[PDB]
Every structure is written in C-alpha cells, then in structure tokens.
Design a protein around this ligand. Sequence first.
Ligand SMILES: Cc1cc2nc3c(=O)[nH]c(=O)nc-3n(C[C@H](O)[C@H](O)[C@H](O)COP(=O)(O)OP(=O)(O)OC[C@H]3O[C@@H](n4cnc5c(N)ncnc54)[C@H](O)[C@@H]3O)c2cc1C
Ligand SMILES: Cc1cc2nc3c(=O)[nH]c(=O)nc-3n(C[C@H](O)[C@H](O)[C@H](O)COP(=O)(O)OP(=O)(O)OC[C@H]3O[C@@H](n4cnc5c(N)ncnc54)[C@H](O)[C@@H]3O)c2cc1C
Ligand code: NA
Ligand code: NA
Lengths: 327, 326
Amino acid sequence: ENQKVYDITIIGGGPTGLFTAFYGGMRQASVKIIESLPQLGGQLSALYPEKYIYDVAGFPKVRAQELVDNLKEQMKKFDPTVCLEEAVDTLEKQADGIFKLVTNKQTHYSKSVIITAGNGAFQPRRLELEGTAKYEKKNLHYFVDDMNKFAGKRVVVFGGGDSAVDWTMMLEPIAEKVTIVHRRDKFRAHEHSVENLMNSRAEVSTPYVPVELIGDDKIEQVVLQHVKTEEKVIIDVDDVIVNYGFVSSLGPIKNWGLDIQKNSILVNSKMETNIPGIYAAGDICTYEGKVKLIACGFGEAPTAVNNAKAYFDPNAKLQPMHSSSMF
Amino acid sequence: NQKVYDITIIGGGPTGLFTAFYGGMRQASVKIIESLPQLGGQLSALYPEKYIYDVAGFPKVRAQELVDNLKEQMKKFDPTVCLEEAVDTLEKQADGIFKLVTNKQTHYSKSVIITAGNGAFQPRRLELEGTAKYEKKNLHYFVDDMNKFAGKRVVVFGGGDSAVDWTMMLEPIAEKVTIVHRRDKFRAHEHSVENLMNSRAEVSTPYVPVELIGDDKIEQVVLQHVKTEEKVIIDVDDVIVNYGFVSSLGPIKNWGLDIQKNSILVNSKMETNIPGIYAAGDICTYEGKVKLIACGFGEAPTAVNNAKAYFDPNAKLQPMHSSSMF
Ligand SMILES: Cc1cc2nc3c(=O)[nH]c(=O)nc-3n(C[C@H](O)[C@H](O)[C@H](O)COP(=O)(O)OP(=O)(O)OC[C@H]3O[C@@H](n4cnc5c(N)ncnc54)[C@H](O)[C@@H]3O)c2cc1C
Ligand SMILES: Cc1cc2nc3c(=O)[nH]c(=O)nc-3n(C[C@H](O)[C@H](O)[C@H](O)COP(=O)(O)OP(=O)(O)OC[C@H]3O[C@@H](n4cnc5c(N)ncnc54)[C@H](O)[C@@H]3O)c2cc1C
Ligand code: NA
Ligand code: NA
C-alpha cells in the first residue's frame, strides 16, 4: 500500500469478513481487511473462543476459535493485507468515485467497500473513573501485547473475568508484584485457573472496587474500597491493567450516509447499500427475511464480493469458476 | 404415511441436507425426498472425489467427505429420508396443505422447500430402441449388492472410472464379466486400467452395443467394432449400464412456479410466487444470485425460518444460539 487504491476493502475481521477476504482472492481482487481489535475473529475470538458452534454447514461440532483458524487458513492463500488495531471513523466517496477511509492510524483508499462490522467496532470496556482518560498514552493498559515490558514492575489488574485471571498468571513470574481486583470473592473463571491464582505470588484483593488513581502524569498509586465495610486500601504500582471485557457499538458507522435500521445496514439482494460501491454482509446487514446466523453471513459474503467485482471490473462475469477446477 | 409434515424438502443435495438439519434446529417435522438411491446431489453424483476450496471453514475438503459431514450433522434430528423418489406433481389442496406425488407414493406437507439444483438425477439411459422393457428385469443402472452377480455372466457398458470400478468389483464375483467402450484408451485412472488388463476381465474395445436379444430377460448382446464394423455376439445373464448421470428440470416446470432460465425465482425470504413453497440452492435465482454451495448454505436457513413463521405463526422468525440445542 501507501497511496494504493485497493479493489475491495473489508471493514471488520469477523468470520464474515474473513470469508469475504478469501472470496475477494478467488476473484483476483486486491483485498484489505481493516479490524478494530488487534486480533481477527470478531465475536468468535473476542466474546466466546471456547464455545462449540453447531450450525455452520458441514461441521456437526466446531469450536469457535478453531472455525476462525480454519477461516484464516482458507484465506492465507491469497495473502490479503490485514490492518489490525484500526477502527474506520470516516468513509466518503471522493470526486472520481474512489472511497477514502480514515482510521485512528491512517488513510486508506478503495474502489468498493464491503462493511462486515457485525454489532460494531470492538473496544475493551473503559474504566469508569472520572480521572482515568489522561493516562491511556502512559501506563494505563487495556492490552498485554509485549508482556516483557512488565519485567520487575509493580502491576495491578482490574477485573474478575476469565480473561483477567489469565493475564495475571502470565504476569506473576514477570512482574515484581502483580495484584488482581474484583468486587466479589468468587472469580468468574475455571477452577484450575483460580486454584493456580490462589497458590501463586499474586495478591487477590476482593471484594473491592477501584475508586481512585493517583499520579501527576504516570499512575503511581491505586486506591481501593471494600464493598461491604467501605474501608480503603492503597497500592503502589508502576502499571495498571484493565480487563472488564469488550464492548461494541455502531458508533461512527451511523455517520457514513448509509440507510440504517435498528443498528443494521439495509441491503438489497446484491448486498448493495444505498451508496453505489458500498456493500454489507453478516450480522450488520439486514433485509426482508434476514436471519442473524453465521451460515447466512457466509452466503452473503461471496454474493457481495461477486456483485462488487461486477461493479468495479466491467469486464467480469457475476458467476465465478468452480473452485474444484482452480487448484 | 397419512402424516402431514411441516417441511418437505425436494432434493437431497448439499443445500437440501443442511435445510433438513436446520429444520430440526427449529423443531419442525422434516422430510427429504430424493430421486437417486443416495444423498449428495451434484457432489456425490458428478464429482465425489474432487476437492472443494470455497466452502466457509474448509480450506480443502473432498466433495464426498463434505457430504458425509452434512449427513452426520443431519442425523441429530433424524429427518424422514425418502430415496429413489422423484416428485412429479405438487399441488396446494383446498385447505392449504401440499400434496406431492412421486413414482412411489403420495406425501403431504404444510410447506415445501425446493432444493432441486438442475433437476432430478437419473442414470444416462442406454440409447437403443428396445431396452426400456428390460429395466424391470436384468438391465441394471444401479448396484446395491454386488454379490447378486455371483457366478453369473455379466456385461458392463462404459468407459469411465465408475465403469472400470464396477468391473474390478465383479471380476472375483462373476463367472465372467466383460466391459465395453468405444475407444481403446479408457477415460479412467491410469493405474486402475492396469489392474483391469491384468485381471480375468474381458475388455471388448473399441465396440458399441447395437442390439439386446431376449424374450423377456436379456440373454444376448450384439456388439459392433467401431472401425471395421464387424460384429460380436456375447451370451449374458445381466447387463449393467454405467454411462454417468443426467439431469433436467422435468416436472418442476409444471408446478405453476415463476421460472426463469431453468431457475425458480425467489425473493429475499426465499419465497416463490406460491405461498408455502420456497427454493434454495442452485435452482433458485434473484438479482445478484451466485451458484455456489456456500450461498446455498446461507439460503437454506433463510428458507426454513421464514417457512417456520409461515406455518407456525405463534413461533419466532429468529432462533437462539446453536450452543443451547445440545
Ligand atoms: C455468545 C454467542 C454465541 C453465538 N452462537 C452462535 C451460533 O451458535 N451460531 C451462529 O450462527 N451464530 C452465533 N452467534 C452469532 C455469530 O457470532 C454472528 O452471527 C457472527 O459472529 C457475526 O459475524 P460478523 O463477521 O458479521 O460480525 P462480527 O463477529 O461482529 O465481526 C465484526 C468485526 O468488525 C469489527 N469492526 C466493526 N466496526 C469496525 C470499524 N469501524 N473499523 C474496524 N473494525 C470494525 C469488529 O471489532 C469485529 O471484529 C453467537 C453470538 C454470541 C455473542
Ligand atoms: C463438476 C462440478 C464442480 C463444482 N465445484 C464447485 C465448487 O468448487 N464450489 C461450489 O460452490 N460449487 C461447485 N459446484 C456447484 C455445486 O455442486 C452446486 O452449487 C451444488 O451442488 C448445489 O447444491 P443443491 O443441493 O442446490 O443442488 P444439487 O447438488 O443439484 O442437488 C439437487 C438434488 O435434488 C434431486 N432432485 C431434483 N429434482 C428432484 C425431484 N423432482 N424429485 C426428487 N429429487 C429431485 C437431485 O437428484 C439432486 O440430488 C460444482 C458443480 C459441478 C458440476
Ligand atoms: Na498465593
Ligand atoms: Na438439495
């Protein structure tokens, strides 16, 4: 890329966007996936990677994350450009019909856009304390990418979920001290992971809620409050890590000039929105009879690709070659 | 039965199989009616050995193995499967129930989802003027149990992989088996042809059958060399044709449906022009429609859920997550 006009840009790397990316390869289009999170997989990877799915055609029983791995494998053949940690904010048609898409990182350009944004861009749930916002460019963390930057550091983890415990286990042998804070004594996690949390050098502050962060520019202390007694505890830290889960909402998608009803983008049977060049597929799209199912999003995706391919490549046919004759 | 089913499915291809599974997920009584004595549609009939690359979640899957997965997925709710039946008439009766007549029996249904592809599959027929009268006897297009040919004299017509395969299966079973093809080069796997030559199988090449002889059962077969036009005659107990499969819409065009270029026109609820009748898969069309197995997989639950809302108005269009049905 740089300055490069792609053919098909996909907003959303959930399962629908992954299969959209694959089928863009089947039609020889230059393909981009733009995804809000630093991982692909949408609801499947973020909100339930361990559940079994029973209604994808041809899988009597498949685990959610292994379906996403299958999908990433299937597309690996045409190597689409994946742009993680980017949330599309503005989307406009410029004077010559090309789309300009602006994220928090950069500008992208595209001949057609297939929005597969599901229930909207995923963000980690924000910490609800009025001071916090100023710390995000410093030592308040919602992701634990490069874990070794916490070697010999004092670190606190807010959250009582399965994901929160696991990040604690990962940090206890890395950090000088690690502490986990949750408002009830029962953690919402696996018995073996709680047992391993209990039996380690990680301090477990329950039933408390954080009530204050102290620091001029970097966080330096955290104030906790017992939920029953109202007594307080103070902790010195080098880094604070929030893990309250994920949230999603349409957000800026409602400012792109699209026809939207009950948080769904309206499409016709070509997966076309009201703006020539823009398509939608998967949980975010709707039409008469639409059913929010993964098998249905997998059918909408090649319809959108094949119709978009006919929109930007006037010398191409709507029907693709049999895949059994291409490899 | 006399039983009026909720969902009767015409066609046991990949689309119909998944349609049937999803009818179980919505707790409708479900029947599949299929022409062949096997499920799998185009996948099982026409290319059961090729690899498919563009079904979601399978980077590379063998066509017959995808069909086996689908049948596995379907056994969970045990739909009533009716093989070797081709639906010939389809009528809405006075009370709104659908009557379907096959070559075997009559069926009734509240709703019908046509997943018929390019039409009913039949074996490509032997093109000779007598023939048809022998089909109730010893002219064979299907072989359930190969051991019914033990110690019999058998001739096999065909030059394809399946013809060679049925011949190799008969070689230790039959007193004598002969295979007939109009060219010397068989259109079959080079290695399997080698086994044929090095076996007790007689290879009558390059010949064409030109006459079947017999009062009621076939008793002899007359062959003709393709270059010299000399003739050979062979005594037989059974004749087995293996020329492949053929398909056409046939009676589907006599059901009052809106049809365009061999496709049933549907809207986005998979509805045809007749309330109570739906279509999904290769046989249905609409603006932007693409003939792909994944698209048939997405059209299938659309048709089920919209049909569930049609025949059970006190039930919801959207079902909860699949993780709570197991
Ligand atoms: C607990 C649970 C169980 C479920 N079980 C089943 C089941 O058994 N069967 C079934 O069929 N369905 C099931 N579903 C629903 C299924 O997950 C959805 O049908 C499917 O995940 C939607 O896929 P998608 O790609 O359309 O959307 P998503 O999975 O939501 O992916 C959209 C992606 O786009 C990203 N994104 C959005 N906006 C932007 C933006 N502006 N810029 C960049 N990225 C953006 C999001 O962060 C996300 O990663 C379940 C859902 C849940 C929550
Ligand atoms: C060689 C070849 C390779 C292909 N490769 C691919 C590929 O890689 N990817 C892809 O997506 N698609 C591929 N396709 C297309 C794919 O096979 C079709 O999309 C798919 O088979 C459609 O499934 P279906 O169940 O809708 O129809 P079908 O598979 O045609 O099944 C319809 C069934 O209905 C039965 N039937 C019809 N009429 C009646 C009746 N009146 N009564 C009773 N039974 C009836 C038939 O006997 C048949 O079993 C290929 C097709 C061919 C021929
Ligand atoms: Na401990
Ligand atoms: Na079918």
